[PDB]
Design a protein around this ligand. Sequence first.
Ligand SMILES: [Mg+2]
Ligand SMILES: [Mg+2]
Lengths: 326, 326
Amino acid sequence: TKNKMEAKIDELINNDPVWSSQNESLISKPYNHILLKPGKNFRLNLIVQINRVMNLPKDQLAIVSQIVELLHNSSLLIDDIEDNAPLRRGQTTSHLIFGVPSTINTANYMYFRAMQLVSQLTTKEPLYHNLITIFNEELINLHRGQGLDIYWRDFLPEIIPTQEMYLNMVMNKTGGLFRLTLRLMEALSPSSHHGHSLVPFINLLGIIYQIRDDYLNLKDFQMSSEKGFAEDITEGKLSFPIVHALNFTKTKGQTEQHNEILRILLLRTSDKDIKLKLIQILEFDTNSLAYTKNFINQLVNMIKNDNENKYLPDELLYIIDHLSEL
Amino acid sequence: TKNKMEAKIDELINNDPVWSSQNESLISKPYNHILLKPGKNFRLNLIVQINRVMNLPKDQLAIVSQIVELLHNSSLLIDDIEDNAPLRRGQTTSHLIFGVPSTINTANYMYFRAMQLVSQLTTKEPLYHNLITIFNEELINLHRGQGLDIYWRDFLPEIIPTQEMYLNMVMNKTGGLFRLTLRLMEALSPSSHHGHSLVPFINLLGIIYQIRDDYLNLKDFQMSSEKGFAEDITEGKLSFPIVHALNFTKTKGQTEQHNEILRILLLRTSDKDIKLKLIQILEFDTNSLAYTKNFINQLVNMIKNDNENKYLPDELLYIIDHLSEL
Ligand SMILES: [Mg+2]
Ligand SMILES: [Mg+2]
């Protein structure tokens, strides 16, 4: 009917868009799948410990936590598509089960659900503005560092990053979410003057976290063809040890080794022997693994020897030792 | 050195993350590539026309425009990855030149750059909160609609949507950015009482826009194997004409035709002959193209005959006829 048609259309356009709980569940599949991954208690533990200094009431702390989890999980769903990763914590990656399209859309949807939860942290307009700014700033930083990490890898050998370039990329990429969490808590703290800001400390933790992630991905494989897959090699990633090896070989004039490192990265290979060959070049030829192990210990020592509490404000050590499960 | 190392690390963590204009350019490549696509003046046209009623000052209108262009472009970069599209406005899609990883990251980065421009629309804390809420809500709506469109396509034949389901998906998917633009403008209007909200009107524009897009994707191919490629068929899309046909064949018990349409969609084919074959079922068996043409005219009529200005508040007609270049 021309009349019934028009009446139904009129009703449609005069109401909010219709969305059912059934709809909500269908599009949530990729997210529900990655929730089966653990490590959630470790992240919560770091938030709970920082809260000994910030004192956010429990209800508010739970919301900060929900925001953090959504952003962290969304980042991993996108990152696995970006890295072409087959597994995440021993399980099949969501994009391989539900497809790349649904996974990208669900991860992006969850970023906006996280943004929505921010307005539940306060009713004070000045504070709210500040919270959304922190959220906006650090997601911008995360995307900038992720953008460089990806560009270096996909356009190699166009740019061979230096250690400093790598470190600035990580301050953006990994620091983004650490700082996002910490800044929200500091903005919300009802506590008078809980001492100097912990941003430097959280930046340091983000850097130790990333470099250790890079280091263990190779070391675990070197120690066992089944402890890890050294998937970072398959991905062609300009990891901390690889950056050291590429610059070391350049510097010492090891032309053949420089080029062979690049060649293997460019193969995107899953061959275990070829991955082990590159790892042993880093072990014996460039000593990049030892150099990295020592760099990490030095970073950790800047905290463990922080007597004048210039970074620190106990549980510290445990968190640092389990930094890999964040 | 252990001393200098620590010193360089302390400096790094006590500063904001380092990001250069050169870094900014690398990450912007996938985005600058789509900027070579036209239609921007048409979208600006619609904003300019609507501004006759809203009267936002030129500077503020320019920022709304920038926000609109970033969201529109980002959503197109992501959509082409989600639909595996080889071309966008006669040109090679960005993910095919810069890779899916850089394109996803850059598109997401730009959503956040747009979010940042929102805080430059006003300094009034109450209005600002409302602007962010508009931004947040409509982007959530765009992702819900997109998630469902993708779900139906990727899970076909699990769910065959009805016309109403399709129309609710469109209110979310397409209406999201039309409403986002209009709501921002209505929230910012200094103008006293610029008449009833134009949201119902913009909703209708979005529906007409989407159904015409689905319609032309097939009609252009039916009229020329080089005017268009009917990529929607290759994508397996549950487009308006396809939804009508699947339900028309179910309804009349034409079991073989119902199944043949599904088989073609499920092929994900680029074979012109097979695509023409689907088009002829829609033209001769279900008459879905005429039905759709007629449905569109009826929608348009609702505006063309809106004498009591229930939806309208001249350039209306031109806008309606060039709705496809938005
Ligand atoms: Mg990764
Ligand atoms: Mg599309």
